[PDB]
């Protein structure tokens, strides 16, 4: 639905530095500031058989402020803060041209260039001294070496031109910058006096690649001149993509989902392989984390730990206690590594199978999806604790059972004896809950080994029963998949 | 959490690396590495 299109071109980038000067008073001997300034430039050049018109803008950063001041006397020479560029300073050259490629520069999958370095040398500036020997600025040079292309925009008068920004590094060069007829010799670097040396333009040549993502709702019919710019793009409605994600569960499978859920999914494993733009593949993971932190579930984790810490120094009746410890068990499940099938495994599996078959179209929207699913998926779940072959099972809705392992018949529950063990003994997610398990034992009479395995939520036995095509387990896991509805 | 508090975690890690404990752990690991290198 979103098609890659390569637009790699060989370009010639022409640019010139901008010089701003501010005079200090008196009779005209001193100066206040000599500094680099943003500089525009227009040109045209022949390439590939057509004349392409280009617009460039040069700017400087990291600039040093040398100084020189002959004293407080009202005629002694000096420049209060005269700049230079050296190792630290960078120069950006925003580049634009009328060619077709720059119309399709909104969404990009990749972008990188190869430009040839250049040597910029300083000119000759005759500081305007009213009388006497003429001071002479001369010399100084650097070399621009390309390092990295990014997106950018010229805030040009008539419109805002989306453009490519080339960040060139620097390298000080041989000619020792001097203030001749004056006390500054054998410096090195390019000062702001006359960075252009009278040249009409400093010139670079190279080749830049680009992989745009022009949209497509049909194979044969691909567009030109991408014009769905962020003026023409707007927030997809929250309920709208909620409905889309809910609809996506039309297609999810039964056993393949469990097979995926039995992976270790990490940051790289999930968030890689998303057909996204460059601006979102840069920080998708951090974007997801930022909104994951403030989710109701995450602040519930924080409240649990802080409440326990504060308690460390502070010193249907059953349904309420069971429900509260059920929420607590959900929190514990999320924070710790359980050895069972662990409902959040299934939640993450559904999440991956949903997001993989989507696309990023100028807005991340994995925030509000990953973090929202983390809290909404599988709203009512169940846990259990086995002890002495009398497993006590609990539901987040408040229900409770206590049934034997060898034969699945329940027993009167023991509140405050389940609570002593739920703190320390390992909790087992009940993906095969007591009701479905009783159905399975009644209809398909099972053995001690597989009974214990299903109680423990062993992936081996779960997949064995799924691949037996057991209707009970098949239907149960299908409903498990179906509550994942955001 | 008064007002845009800094990164507590990374701020503490800024010099939890240089503690006596961390230096000792790195020292032990590099000692085993040198033992591996030279029998």
């Amino acid at each position: 639905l979103w098609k890659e299109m390569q637009y790699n071109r060989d370009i010639i980038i022409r640019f010139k530095f901008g010089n701003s000067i501010v005079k200090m008073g008196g009779l005209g001997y001193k100066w206040s500031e000599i500094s680099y300034k943003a500089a525009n430039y227009q040109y045209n050049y022949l390439r590939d058989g057509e004349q392409v018109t280009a617009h460039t803008t040069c700017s400087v950063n990291g600039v040093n402020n040398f100084s020189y001041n002959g004293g407080f006397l009202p005629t002694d020479f000096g420049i209060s803060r005269y700049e230079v560029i050296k190792e630290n300073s960078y120069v950006y050259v925003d580049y634009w041209d009328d060619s077709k490629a720059f119309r399709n520069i909104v969404y990009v999958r990749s972008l990188a260039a190869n430009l040839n370095s250049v040597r910029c040398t300083g000119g000759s500036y005759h500081f305007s001294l009213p009388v006497g020997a003429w001071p002479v600025i001369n010399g100084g040079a650097v070399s621009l070496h390309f390092a990295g292309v990014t997106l950018s925009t010229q805030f040009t008068d008539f419109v805002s031109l989306n453009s490519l920004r080339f960040r060139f590094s620097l390298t000080v060069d041989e000619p020792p910058f001097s203030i001749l007829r004056t006390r500054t010799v054998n410096l090195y670097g390019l000062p702001a006096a006359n960075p252009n040396n009278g040249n009409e333009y400093y010139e670079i040549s190279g080749r830049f690649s680009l992989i745009s993502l022009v949209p497509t709702n049909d194979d044969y019919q691909t567009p030109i001149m991408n014009s769905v710019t962020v003026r023409q793009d707007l927030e997809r409605q929250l309920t709208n993509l909620r409905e889309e994600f809910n609809s996506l569960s039309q297609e999810i499978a039964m056993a393949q989902l469990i097979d995926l859920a039995l992976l270790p999914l990490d940051m790289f494993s999930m968030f890689s392989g998303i057909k996204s733009t460059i601006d979102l593949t840069k920080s998708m993971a951090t974007s997801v984390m930022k909104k994951f932190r403030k989710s109701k579930l995450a602040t519930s984790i924080s409240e649990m730990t802080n409440s326990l810490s504060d308690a460390a120094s502070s010193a249907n009746d059953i349904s309420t206690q069971t429900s509260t410890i059920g929420k607590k068990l959900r929190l514990k499940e999320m924070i710790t590594q359980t050895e069972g099938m662990s409902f959040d495994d299934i939640s993450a599996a559904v999440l991956k199978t949903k997001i993989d078959m989507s696309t990023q179209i100028g807005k991340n929207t994995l925030p509000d999806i990953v973090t929202e699913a983390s809290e909404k998926f599988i709203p009512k779940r169940s846990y259990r604790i086995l002890k002495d072959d009398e497993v006590m099972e609990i539901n987040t809705e408040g229900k409770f059972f206590a049934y034997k392992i060898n034969t699945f018949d329940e027993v009167p529950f023991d509140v405050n004896k389940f609570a002593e063990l739920v703190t320390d003994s390992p909790v087992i997610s009940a993906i095969i809950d007591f009701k479905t398990l009783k159905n399975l034992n009644d209809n398909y009479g099972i053995t001690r080994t597989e009974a214990l395995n299903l109680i423990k939520s062993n992936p081996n036995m779960l997949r064995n029963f799924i691949n037996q095509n057991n209707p009970i387990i098949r239907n149960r896991i299908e409903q498990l998949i179906l509550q994942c509805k955001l | 959490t008064i007002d845009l508090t800094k990164s507590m975690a990374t701020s503490v890690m800024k010099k939890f690396r240089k503690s006596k404990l961390a230096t000792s752990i790195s020292e032990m690991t590099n000692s085993l590495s040198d033992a591996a290198s030279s029998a």
Binding site: M267, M289, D344, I346, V370 | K6
Partner: peptide, 25 residues
Amino acid sequence: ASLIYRQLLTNSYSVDLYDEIEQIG
């Protein structure tokens, strides 16, 4: 597969220095 939620929570500290990037920039 649940490992990713734990990874998000554990590694969430870096969002602080990411928003530091955003505000300093």
